[PDB]
Design a protein around this ligand. Structure first.
Ligand SMILES: Nc1ncnc2c1ncn2[C@@H]1O[C@H](COP(=O)(O)OP(=O)(O)O)[C@@H](O)[C@H]1O
Ligand SMILES: Nc1ncnc2c1ncn2[C@@H]1O[C@H](COP(=O)(O)OP(=O)(O)O)[C@@H](O)[C@H]1O
Ligand SMILES: Nc1ncnc2c1ncn2[C@@H]1O[C@H](COP(=O)(O)OP(=O)(O)O)[C@@H](O)[C@H]1O
Lengths: 257, 120, 257, 120
DNA sequence: AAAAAAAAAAAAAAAAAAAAAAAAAAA
DNA sequence: TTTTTTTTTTTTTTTTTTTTTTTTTTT
C-alpha cells in the first residue's frame, strides 16, 4: 500500500538545513580550532539540540593506524541532578573504555587518562540545566587542564547557575544565542518545510496568506511546534483521502495541541 | 441465605460503562497511536479508576515466548510524596522485573532498560 | 613498493573450507535446533576454534524490531581459573549488556535475565578445560533450567574433568571427535591451501614428493603448522625476488621449527 | 608554512617577567629561610599561579650525591574536595616514591617519612 | 529555621589451595 | 639402599556487611 509509505515517512523525524544550523556550525569550528570554551543559550523547541548532533555527525573517529581512534568531538547528555561521578562515567563510556569501580577521585583519574589518549578537540555538555550545581567546578577543572574547548548547550536557567560561581562565569564569558522564527524568516521556513519535509502529492500553498497566518500564530516561532503540527495534520489528511492539508485540518490540530 | 447472597453482590465491585469512559477511551487510543503525552483533569469520584481499569482491560499483554512481553501500556499510581526512586520502582514492578538496589541513577538505568524491552 | 603490498597480504588471516569444518557446522546446527548439549574434543592446532568462529559468523544476530535483538549463538572464551562471576560477566558483556555493581547472587540472575530476551539456543564454550569444577554446576544449571544447547569446546583435560561428575557427564554425553590429516588427505589439503590462500602468482607445486616429505615431517598432520610454515616460506622466497617457493626455503622453515 | 609556524608560536604559552613576580619570589625566599608558614591571596586571572611555578623552577631537586634526590620545594594542585588521603598521596607521588595500600594513618606515616628524607 | 534523603573510611569475619619438608614404610 | 608412599605440617588469595561522619538539598 502506497499510503503506508507516506505514513511511515511522516512518523519519523528528520533534519532540514536551516540558516540557524549553519550559523552555529561555522561558529563552532572556530572555537574548536581556537581551543576556547564557549556557551550556547536559547529557548526550547528551537532546534539547538539538532544542530549539535548535526555538527557531531560530520566529524567522526578516525582509526587508520592500529592505535586508539581519535574522537575530535564528544557529545554527552547528563541526567537530572547528575553528579560528578556520574558525569565522569558518561565520558568514559562514550570513548569505549571500561569503567573501573571506585570513588570519585578514581573516576577522575580514569577520565583524564582516556581524554588525553584521544584527540578530544571539543566537549559538549547537552542541557546543562539539569546538571548539578557542584559539577560546574569539575567541568572547569577539565577545561583549564586539558585545553579542551567546552560548550554548554542549555536554556535560560543556565545563566542563573553560571552567574553564582564567579570562576565558572569567567570560564564561559562568551556565548551564542538561539532565538525564534518570525516574519519573513518564519514564512520562508514554512514554505521550505513544505518543499523539503512534507511529501503530500499536492501542495496546499501553506505560504498563502489564509493559512500561513494560522501557522504563525500557532507555532509562535518554535520550529518544534511547526514540525509537530505540520507532520500531524499532514498524516491525518490521508485516511480521509486528501492530497493536501486543508485550512480546517490546520485549525483542528492547533486547538488540541 | 439468598438475601445475604444478594447483599454480597451489592457490596461487591462492578463497572457501569459511562459516556465519559467511552469518550476518554477514544481519545486515549488516539494519543497512544500518536504517542503524545497529555493530562486528564477533572473532579474525583467521576469514574477515574473505572476508566483506567476498563482501558487496561482492552489491551492485555501476551507472552508467547521467553522474550519480554508485548506490553503496550504501563499503569502506575504514585504514592503520596512519591520521589524519583518510587516512580522507577513501581514501573519496574509492574513489568514483572526485579527491583535493582542502589541509588536514583541505577533505578533510572534499570527503568529505561525494562521500558525499552517492551513496546510501552 | 608493490612487493610490500603483495607480501603484506600473505600475513593475513583467512579461512579455507574443509571437510571437518563442513561436518562441524551441520552437526552443531542440528544440536542447536534440537536445543541439546554436546561436547567437542580434539588435539591442539586443529582449527576447531576457527570452525567455531566460522559457525558463529554464519548466524547473524538480527535486529528486525526494537525489542531486544535475537542473538541465537553465544561464544565465550574463558581465561585461567575462571570463577562464576567472570563466566557470568562474559555472558553479560557478549550480549552488549551493562555489568552492574552488586553481589554474586544478583550477578547470577543478571545473566539469566539477559539470556531470555535473545534466543541464545546454543552457548559455545571454547577452551572448556580452563574452568573451575564449581563453575560446571552453573554451566549445567543453564542446561537443566533452560532449553540451551550448551557446547563445551576442549581438549583431553576436558574429558578428565567432566567424567568426575555423573550428572555433568549425562547432560553432556553427546560429543564430537576430531582426527588428523595424513596421506592423500594431507596432500589434498596442501594443494587446496596453495590455490585458496597462497598469494604468490606462480604455483609452487606443494603437492610434490619432496615438498610433501618436508611438510609431512614438519606439520605432522596439524593444520596450524601447515598454515604458518607455508606463509613463512612464501615470504622467505619473496625476499629473494621469486614468484614461487623454492624447495630449500621450505626445508629451512622446517629446520627452524 | 612559515606563517602557520608563527601562528602556532602565538597559540602556545610563554612566561614573561613582571615586578609582581619578582616581589613574590623575594617574599617566598625570605619565608623559606625563616621556615615560616604563610599564605598568598589575590583575584583570579592575575597570574600568581605562574609566578609560584616560576619560583619552583628556580631551584630543582639536586641528585648529584649518592643519596636520594633532595627536593627543596614541593608544589601540588589538590583536586576539588580532596580529603586527608589524596593530599598525602599527591605529596608521595611528587617525590617519585611508591604508594602503599592502607589507611589514612599509614599514608600519614609514609608521608612524614618521605618528607624527612628529602629536604622539603 | 529544622527534620529527612545522600559519598568516603574503618573494621570484623571465613574458606579453599598449594607447596614443601619430614618421617615412616616396603622389597 | 632405592624408591615409594603417605602423612602431616606449615604457609598462602577472594567476598560482604555495618556503622559513623559529613555535605547538600528540599521542606
Ligand atoms: N532542522 C530540524 N529538522 C527537523 N526537526 C527539527 C529541526 N530543528 C528542530 N527540530 C525539532 O525540534 C525538536 C528538538 O528541539 P530541542 O531539542 O528542544 O532543541 P533545544 O533544546 O535547543 O530547544 C525535535 O522534536 C525536532 O523535531
Ligand atoms: N579451515 C581453516 N581455515 C583457516 N585457518 C585454519 C583452518 N584450519 C586451521 N587453521 C589455522 O589454525 C590456526 C589457529 O588455530 P586455532 O584457532 O588455535 O584452532 P585450535 O585451537 O582448534 O587448534 C590459524 O593460524 C589458522 O591459519
Ligand atoms: N607571568 C606571566 N607571563 C605570561 N602570562 C601570564 C603570566 N601570568 C599569568 N599569565 C596568563 O594567565 C594564565 C595563567 O595564569 P593563572 O594560572 O590564570 O593565574 P591565577 O590562577 O592566579 O588566575 C596564562 O594563560 C597566561 O596567559
Amino acid at each position: 500500500e502506497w499510503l503506508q509509505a507516506e505514513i511511515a515517512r511522516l512518523k519519523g523525524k528528520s533534519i532540514v538545513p536551516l540558516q540557524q544550523v549553519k550559523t552555529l556550525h561555522d561558529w563552532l569550528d572556530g572555537k574548536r580550532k581556537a581551543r576556547k570554551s564557549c556557551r550556547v543559550v536559547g529557548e526550547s523547541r528551537t532546534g539547538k539540540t539538532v544542530a549539535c548532533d548535526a555538527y557531531r555527525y560530520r566529524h567522526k573517529p578516525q582509526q587508520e593506524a592500529g592505535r586508539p581512534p581519535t574522537v575530535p568531538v564528544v557529545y554527552i547528555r547528563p541526567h537530572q541532578k547528575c553528579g560528578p561521578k556520574d558525569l565522569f562515567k558518561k565520558i568514559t563510556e562514550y570513548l569505549k573504555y571500561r569503567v573501573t569501580k571506585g570513588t570519585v577521585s578514581d573516576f577522575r583519574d580514569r577520565t583524564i587518562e582516556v581524554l588525553k589518549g584521544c584527540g578530544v578537540e571539543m566537549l559538549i555538555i547537552d542541557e546543562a540545566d539539569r546538571l548539578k550545581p557542584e559539577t560546574f567546578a569539575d567541568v572547569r577543572d577539565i577545561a583549564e587542564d586539558l585545553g579542551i574547548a567546552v560548550v554548554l548547550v542549555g536554556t535560560d536557567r543556565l545563566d542563573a547557575v553560571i552567574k553564582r560561581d564567579e570562576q565558572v562565569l569567567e570560564r564561559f564569558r562568551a556565548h551564542l544565542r538561539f532565538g525564534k522564527l518570525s516574519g519573513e524568516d518564519f514564512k520562508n521556513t514554512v514554505e521550505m518545510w513544505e518543499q523539503m519535509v512534507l511529501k503530500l502529492p499536492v501542495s496546499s500553498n501553506l505560504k498563502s496568506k489564509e493559512m500561513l497566518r494560522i501557522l504563525t500564530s500557532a507555532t509562535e516561532g518554535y520550529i518544534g511546534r511547526l514540525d509537530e503540527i505540520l507532520r500531524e495534520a499532514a498524516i491525518r489528511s490521508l485516511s480521509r483521502g486528501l492530497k493536501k492539508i486543508d485550512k480546517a485540518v490546520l485549525q483542528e490540530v492547533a486547538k488540541e495541541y
